[PDB]
Amino acid sequence: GSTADNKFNKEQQNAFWEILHLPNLNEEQRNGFIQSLKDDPSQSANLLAEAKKLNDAQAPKA
C-alpha cells in the first residue's frame, strides 16, 4: 500500500494529539515532534516521552 501507513492505533495515535496539544510547549516544538514521529512510528515512544517531559519543565505556568 505504501510503507508503514503510520499504524498509529488508538494507543499510538494518542501521541499525536498530546503532541499537537502540548498546552505549554512551543507549538513549533510540537510540530517538530509530529514530523519526527510521523516519518518514524517506532519512535512514538521517544517523541511522545520527550515531548511529555519537555512540556512539563518548559511549561510556563508554575
From Swiss-Prot:
Q: What subcellular locations does the record give?
A: Secreted, Cell wall
Q: How is it used?
A: Important immunodiagnostic reagent because of its ability to bind the Fab and Fc fragments of a wide range of mammalian immunoglobulins.
Immunoglobulin-binding region B repeat residues? 4-61
Note the SS bond partners. none
- Know anything about its domains from the record? Each of the immunoglobulin-binding region repeats can bind the Fc region of an immunoglobulin.
Please explain the role this protein plays, according to its UniProt record: Plays a role in the inhibition of the host innate and adaptive immune responses. Possesses five immunoglobulin-binding domains that capture both the fragment crystallizable region (Fc region) and the Fab region (part of Ig that identifies antigen) of immunoglobulins. In turn, Staphylococcus aureus is protected from phagocytic killing via inhibition of Ig Fc region. In addition, the host elicited B-cell response is prevented due to a decrease of antibody-secreting cell proliferation that enter the bone marrow, thereby decreasing long-term antibody production.
Q: How does it assemble?
A: Interacts with host TNFRSF1A; this interaction leads to the stimulation of both surface expression and shedding of TNFRSF1A.
Q: Which family does it belong to?
A: Belongs to the immunoglobulin-binding protein SpA family.
Protein name as annotated = Immunoglobulin G-binding protein A
Within the intact protein, the region shown is 212 to 270 of 508
